[PDB]
Amino acid sequence: DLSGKMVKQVEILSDGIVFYEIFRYRLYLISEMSPVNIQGVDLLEGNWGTVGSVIFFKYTIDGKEKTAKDIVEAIDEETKSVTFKIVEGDLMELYKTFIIIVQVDTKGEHNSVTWTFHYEKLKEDVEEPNTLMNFCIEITKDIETYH
C-alpha cells in the first residue's frame, strides 16, 4: 500500500564499464562531474567499492541543499549492479525505507543504465520520488558527457 517501485532506464553513449565503476568504486568523482547536483561524497566507513561501506552525500534538489547517508547493501559484478540503502538524510523525512539500485548493461553494442527505487512512505499522501529520479537521470547525463 505504502510501498512503491520506480524504474527508469536510459541509454548511454559513454563506456558502460567506466560508468559502472564510478558508482561502485569512485563515487568521489561524481561531484566534479555533476557539481550542480552533488557538492560532495565522503567515505564515512569501510573502503570504496565494497558492500558495507557507508557514505555521505551533499546534494541539491530543486536548488535546495540536502544530505544523505547511504550503506552499500549489495553488489553484483555479473549484472554490474550496486545497491544503496538510505539510512539518514532528508529523504528519511518522507520515506520510512528507500533503496536505490544502479544496474548497467555493458555486454551489448548499446549500453544503458537502469535506476530502480524501492521505497516505503511514512504516510499515504507522501509524493512519488519523481524529482529524485530526474535528478539521477541528470547526473547520468553529466557523467556521460564528461568524457
Ligand SMILES: [Cl-]
Ligand atoms: Cl564487497
